[PDB]
Each structure stands twice: as structure tokens, then as C-alpha cells.
Amino acid sequence: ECEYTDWKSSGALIPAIYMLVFLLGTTGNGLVLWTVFRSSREKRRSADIFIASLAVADLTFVVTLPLWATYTYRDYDWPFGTFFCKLSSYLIFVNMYASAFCLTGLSFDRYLAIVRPVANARLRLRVSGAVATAVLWVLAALLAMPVMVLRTTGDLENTNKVQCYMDYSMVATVSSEWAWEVGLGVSSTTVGFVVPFTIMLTCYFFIAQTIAMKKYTCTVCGYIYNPEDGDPDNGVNPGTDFKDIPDDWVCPLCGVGKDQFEEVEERRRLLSIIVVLVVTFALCKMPYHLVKTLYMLGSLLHWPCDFDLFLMNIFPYCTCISYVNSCLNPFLYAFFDPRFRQACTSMLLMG
Amino acid sequence: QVQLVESGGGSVQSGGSLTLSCAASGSTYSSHCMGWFRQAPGKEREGVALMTRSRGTSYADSVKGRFTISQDNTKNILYLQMNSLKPEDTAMYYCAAVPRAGIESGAYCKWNMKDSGSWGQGTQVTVSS
Ligand SMILES: [Zn+2]
Numbered sequence: 446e447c448e449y450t451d452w453k454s455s456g457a458l459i460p461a462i463y464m465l466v467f468l469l470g471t472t473g474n475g476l477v478l479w480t481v482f483r484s485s486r487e488k489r490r491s492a493d494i495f496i497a498s499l500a501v502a503d504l505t506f507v508v509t510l511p512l513w514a515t516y517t518y519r520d521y522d523w524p525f526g527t528f529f530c531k532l533s534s535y536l537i538f539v540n541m542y543a544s545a546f547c548l549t550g551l552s553f554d555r556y557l558a559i560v561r562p563v564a565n566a567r568l569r570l571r572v573s574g575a576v577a578t579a580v581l582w583v584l585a586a587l588l589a590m591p592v593m594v595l596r597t598t599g600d601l602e603n604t605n606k607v608q609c610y611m612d613y614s615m616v617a618t619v620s621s622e623w624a625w626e627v628g629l630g631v632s633s634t635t636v637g638f639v640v641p642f643t644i645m646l647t648c649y650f651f652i653a654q655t656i657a658m659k660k661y662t663c664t665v666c667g668y669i670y671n672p673e674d675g676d677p678d679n680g681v682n683p684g685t686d687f688k689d690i691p692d693d694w695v696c697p698l699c700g701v702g703k704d705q706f707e708e709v710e711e712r713r714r715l716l717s718i719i720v721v722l723v724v725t726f727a728l729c730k731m732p733y734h735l736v737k738t739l740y741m742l743g744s745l746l747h748w749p750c751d752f753d754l755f756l757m758n759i760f761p762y763c764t765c766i767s768y769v770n771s772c773l774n775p776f777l778y779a780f781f782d783p784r785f786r787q788a789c790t791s792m793l794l795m796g
Numbered sequence: 797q798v799q800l801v802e803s804g805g806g807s808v809q810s811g812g813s814l815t816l817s818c819a820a821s822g823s824t825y826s827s828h829c830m831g832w833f834r835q836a837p838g839k840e841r842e843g844v845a846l847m848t849r850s851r852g853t854s855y856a857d858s859v860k861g862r863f864t865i866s867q868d869n870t871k872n873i874l875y876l877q878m879n880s881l882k883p884e885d886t887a888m889y890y891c892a893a894v895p896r897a898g899i900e901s902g903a904y905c906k907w908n909m910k911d912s913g914s915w916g917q918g919t920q921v922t923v924s925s
Contacts, residue, residue, distance in 0.1 A: 446866065446868055446870070447825075447866075447867055447868065447869055447870075448847065448852055448853070448866060448867055449825070449829075449847065449849070449852075449867075449903075450848075450849075450850070450851065450852045451849075451850060521902060599909060600908060601849070601897070601901075601904040601905065601906050601907065601908060601909060602848055602849055602850065602904055602905055602906075602907050602908060603854070603907060603908045604850065608901060608902070608904060609901070610897045610898075610900070610901030610902075610904065611897055611898045611900060611901060612897075613895075614909075619798065619895055619913055619914060620797040620798050620822060622827070622895045623824065623826070623827035623895065626827075626897070626898045629898075630898060736899075737898075737899060737900075740826070740899055743826055744824050744826035744827050747824075748826070749869075750825060750867075750869045750870075753825060753826045753903075754903075756899070757899055757902070757903040760899040760900075760902075761902075764900075
């Protein structure tokens with residue numbers, strides 16, 4: 446009793462945004478690529494090899510958005526031949542795997558750094574930062590290939606308008622065709638989102654349970670109380686935190702009570718950026734990754750007629766917001782990265 | 797793994813009310829679209845009433861306003877309600893079906909690509925004077 450047809454068009458709302466984002470994006474990652482390379486030194490911060498890589502994939506993406514800005518503008522008309530439609534598409538997914546793979550190497554930096562599972566000679570942090578960055582780019586390009594090979598152009602539906610689209614006609618037969626849509630889709634998001642995002646959640650966890658316990662400096666005599674070491678000479682064993690130390694405890698060095706101590710909140714900015722990145726990363730990339738995952742569950746749990754169409758005319762949006770998640774890391778480094786903000790003022794002056 | 801069986805069409809006289817089921821199997825609304833053709837014969841094959849991505853249904857200029865078409869994912873069946881029938885609509889009707897595309901394309905029915913998709917025997921309709 447049920448039929449399938451689009452929602453009231455958004456006009457040029459998306460292609461507008463697409464250009465806005467190409468505009469801010471090409472100019473915003475343009476910087477964090479100079480700011481990291483304006484520095485020539487071995488004063489490159491650990492988590493900088495990944496911020497560069499983050500900028501490059503966000504960049505190679507947003508440069509193509511003039512292409513996707515017209516195609517969505519002429520209501521799906523691709524006048525750029527099969528090559529670009531292949532290649533341009535191929536770079537949507539390249540960026541998406543890279544952006545994920547960076548944001549966890551960005552995080553696996555802070556786990557290696559801020560928990561140090563092995564001793565510091567064997568921690569090999571630059572290499573683990575740098576071997577990470579190489580095999581990163583090789584995955585995100587390799588596993589992005591079925592979108593290079595299979596995406597073709599073609600006027601579906603008899604309408605005098607070309608469409609760029611995934612064509613399972615090499616790989617599939619007409620009944621198994623939806624299978625390759627589903628498998629190549631649950632691959633993408635799985636490797637693309639659920640594996641990375643839980644990794645970053647896994648990393649983000651172990652960081653807090655060691656970040657958990659707090660050092661404490663004696664405000665009068667200077668002695669610092671680390672909960673790993675403790676003060677076992679005075680009864681209070683290691684691994685204990687400060688508020689549990691019996692309230693009769695006093696400074697081992699001078700003997701003022703707990704009344705005069707001072708928790709150090711060791712100002713880290715590397716970690717605080719890496720989450721604001723991730724928590725907006727996983728806020729823009731969740732929609733597109735929730736719906737594509739419901740709709741390929743939606744052919745294979747048999748969702749009502751209502752739903753499948755819903756999730757189809759929902760999608761061009763979720764694409765478009767997850768697409769902006771590129772031209773935001775440039776803004777986030779501004780509102781939050783010290784090394785970044787400073788490296789800007791500096792060039793400014795000179796001219 | 798996909799079958800389509802046309803049932804409903806015999807002989808009716810002008811101005812009649814026919815309705816033609818295309819009971820479908822293996823197909824999914826989610827992955828597949830549905831449409832109707834016909835042959836005279838002595839002529840060619842011609843699209844009648846399809847189920848499109850963009851417009852609700854793309855009728856042909858001749859059958860427009862007379863035929864009504866509907867899907868029913870519940871029992872998975874495509875319909876063709878023919879009202880006020882013309883003898884030039886004397887012909888044998890088949891239902892096809894076609895795969896759509898990853899929503900990255902727009903869930904677009906591949907109507908044109910090849911119409912070497914899921915077909916059926918056709919059912920034949922006869923309109924006399
Ligand atoms: Zn003291």
C-alpha cells in the first residue's frame with residue numbers, strides 16, 4: 446500500500462554548504478599544513494606527524510567539493526566523465542579511512558605516552574608514531590579501491606541526467622547484487638568507524654585510570670605525593686590516593702596536615718585537543734555511519750516500507766554534515782592548539 | 797532467485813476496469829524497483845507504468861490518468877489498476893524489476909541500465925469493441 450519518492454528538495458542548501466566547506470576547508474587545512482611545516486626543527490611534537498596527515502586527507506577531499514557541489518546542484522548531473530567520478534569518489538572514502546586512522550594514531554600516541562605500557566627505551570614512540578603514519582596511508586588507499594574500480598557514471602532511470610554510482614555489475618549477479626552493497630558497506634563502516642572509534646575509546650579509557658590518581662604537592666615544604674609511590678614509611682602504602690590517607694596523616698617532611706596540600710592538575714593540551722577532535726569527529730561521522738548501517742540491516746531485517754524510504758531521503762544530509770567534519774579540525778586547532786595559534790600570529794607580523 | 801508472476805488479465809470490453817497483480821518473490825522493496833511493460837504484438841515493447849526514484853511513478857503519455865499502480869511490500873506485489881480501457885491498450889503485459897544502488901547514489905532504480913533484470917511471463921489483456 447506503499448510507494449517511494451523524495452522529500453521536498455533542499456534547493457541549493459547542500460551545494461551551498463559544500464562550497465562554504467571547500468572555501469573554509471582549502472584555506473583552513475592549508476594553514477595547519479604550513480604551521481606544522483613552517484617549523485623546520487626536531488621541535489615537531491609527537492602527535493604532529495598525524496596532524497599533518499589529518500590535514501592532507503581533509504585537503505585532497507575538499508578540493509573535489511566543487512565537483513560534488515555541481516552534481517548535487519543540477520540534481521545529480523555529473524558532466525566530468527567517468528574518470529573523475531571514479532577518482533573523485535575514490536577520495537571521499539580515502540579521506541574517511543585516513544581521518545579515522547589518524548585520529549586513533551593521534552590517540553595511540555597519548556596512550557603510549559601517558560600510560561607507557563613498556564619501559565621508555567622499548568617504547569619507540571616516534572617510530573610507532575611514524576610506522577603508524579605509513580601503513581595508515583597504505584590501508585586507507587588500499588581498502589578504498591572498490592570505490593575506485595566499481596563506481597561508474599550512468600543515467601539511471603531515464604531522465605537526461607548522469608549519475609555517479611556504485612555499480613555491482615562487475616562483481617555481482619542481480620540477486621546477489623544487494624549482497625555486495627551490504628558487504629562492501631559493512632566493511633567500510635566497520636574498519637572505518639567501529640574498529641577505530643572503539644580503539645580511541647579503548648585508548649581514552651586506560652588514559653583516565655592512570656591519569657586517575659593525582660599527585661599532590663605540599664604547599665609549605667614542597668614534597669610531592671605521587672599515589673604510585675605512596676608514603677609507606679608512615680603507614681600509608683602505595684597505590685592509595687590522597688583523600689583516603691587517614692585525616693591524621695601529615696607531611697612526612699615537615700608535618701602539616703592534609704589541610705595544606707594542593708592537587709596538581711598537570712595542564713595537558715595534546716590530550717585535550719585529541720578528544721575535542723574525536724568528539725566532534727564522532728559527532729559528524731556518526732549519522733552517515735548509523736544510517737548506512739541501518740539501511741543495510743534494513744534490507745535484511747525487513748523494515749517497514751516507511752523506514753527504508755525515510756533513511757534514503759535522510760542520507761544526502763548525513764553525507765553533507767560528515768563532509769564538513771574536514772573543515773573543522775582547522776577551526777579546532779585554532780580554539781584549542783597553542784602551538785597553532787602562535788605560529789599564526791607570527792607570519793602575520795612579518796609581511 | 798527472483799520470480800514475478802502476473803495474474804489478472806483476460807478479455808474486457810472498452811471502458812472496463814482491470815487490475816493486474818505482479819506477485820513477487822526473492823525481491824525486496826529495499827533493493828528492487830518494479831514496473832510494467834506490454835507488447836501488442838506486431839509492435840515493440842513499451843514502458844507502461846514504472847515505479848521511479850524521483851517522481852512517484854512514471855506513466856506513459858497514453859495510459860496516463862487511466863491506469864493506477866501500487867507496490868505492497870507487506871505481501872510484496874506490484875499492481876496495475878486499469879480504468880476506462882482502450883482497445884489500443886490491447887496487449888500482453890509483463891512486470892520487470894531492477895536493483896537500486898547504495899544510498900551513496902540515492903537509492904536509484906536501475907531502470908534503464910539494462911532491462912535484462914528480473915522479468916516475468918507477462919499476462920495478456922484484450923480490449924474489444
Ligand atoms: Zn610539607
